[PDB]
Design a protein around this ligand. Structure first.
Ligand SMILES: Cc1ccc(C(C)C)cc1Oc1nccc(-c2c(-c3ccc(C(F)(F)F)cc3)ncn2[C@@H]2CCN(CCN(C)C)C2)n1
Ligand SMILES: [Cl-]
Length: 124
């Protein structure tokens, strides 16, 4: 199948709040992961056409990527830090679901996830 529309990133009728934790999720966690040498497959929606993955969105019904997470943070889409942390977990999970243990892409995700977990364990 083709790509779905990307996930929602802005909601004008939803209240906005800025939190120490959300600030840290954007300025520390997202920033650190984004700059990781293994991050580039995770910085934008999986392009099912360019990558020849016509079953990706048949298997993955809750797509997520760090580009989307970045926009959600920056637009104050998130009200609870757990929403953001869940999105990161969804992203890593999607990679594991689509692929198989031992696949090269899974090793990249695991490296990023380990760093993510360390930074989330220091959440203010
Ligand atoms: C790094 C890489 C290697 C090879 C290729 C070929 C197309 C040349 C491109 C490519 O670059 C790339 N860019 C973007 C995505 C993925 C990706 C993902 C993916 C899934 C979810 C997420 C999310 F959700 F966490 F963000 C992020 C990434 N899963 C697999 N792939 C590759 C595509 C083809 N596949 C090979 C087939 N396997 C099953 C043997 C490896 N790869
Ligand atoms: Cl970049």
């Amino acid at each position: 199948s083709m790509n779905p529309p990307p996930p929602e990133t802005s909601n004008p009728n939803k209240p906005k709040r800025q939190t120490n934790q959300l600030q840290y999720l954007l300025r520390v966690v997202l920033k650190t992961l984004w700059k990781h040498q293994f991050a580039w497959p995770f910085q934008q929606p999986v392009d099912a056409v360019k990558l020849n993955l016509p079953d990706y969105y048949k298997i993955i019904k809750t797509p997520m990527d760090m580009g989307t997470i970045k926009k959600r943070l920056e637009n104050n889409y998130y009200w609870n830090a757990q929403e953001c942390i869940q999105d990161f977990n969804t992203m890593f999970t999607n990679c594991y679901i689509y692929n198989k243990p031992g696949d090269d892409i899974v090793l990249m995700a695991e490296a990023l996830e380990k760093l993510f977990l360390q930074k989330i364990n220091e959440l203010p």
